[PDB]
Design a protein around this ligand. Sequence first.
Ligand SMILES: [Ca+2]
Ligand SMILES: [Ca+2]
Ligand SMILES: [Mg+2]
Ligand SMILES: [Mg+2]
Lengths: 120, 120
Amino acid sequence: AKTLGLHILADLYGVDADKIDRVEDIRELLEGAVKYANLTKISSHYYQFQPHGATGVVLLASHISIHTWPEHGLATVDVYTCGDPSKAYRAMDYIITQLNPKRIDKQVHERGIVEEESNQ
Amino acid sequence: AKTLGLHILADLYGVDADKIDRVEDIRELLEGAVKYANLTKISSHYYQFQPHGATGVVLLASHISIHTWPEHGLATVDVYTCGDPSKAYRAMDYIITQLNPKRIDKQVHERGIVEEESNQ
Ligand SMILES: [Ca+2]
Ligand SMILES: [Ca+2]
Ligand SMILES: [Mg+2]
Ligand SMILES: [Mg+2]
């Protein structure tokens, strides 16, 4: 049995408000993750919330997402890729180092388990 | 302490291939979830994979996502909302009933824990 994808989600705390308050920040961040992880993008969409904070989602060829709350020094991140687990890990390592959080809560899930042998 | 958001993820198995093979299907499905759950959408993006299967992501005003594999009767779903947990549950209940999977693996996460009292 093999997993079709690896999904890493993390809640990052103690993140400087200036690193996650505008779309520009999230965009640079996720563009940087994608390239560092050598992932291929289908498209990317961002949204600026008032008075600050933003959402960013990247559809991969699964997805990478980030929602932020400057007032709480918090960013919730998702890195879900299919096939190459090392890319999911690299993307998350990049995002975390760039945001440099003080505390983290992380979890990993193998999404979709399928047989390698079929019944003949 | 309160949670800023509720994130439900589920891997649905035994799903008829015809219910998850084209974008049209995912679009109808997610549009239906959003309305049934009374969620407000910012935008929505879909992608058609060859020879079939699709990705769908909806940015909420967090997000709802779905990736599918017709050949495996599989769909991986994410319903992440902020503030109203009952909406996340309704959205996932809708998606599941529409797809009517035979087997399910689900998990719920409270994303982002913040204090209700501050230190004076
Ligand atoms: Ca981008
Ligand atoms: Ca829609
Ligand atoms: Mg900034
Ligand atoms: Mg169909």
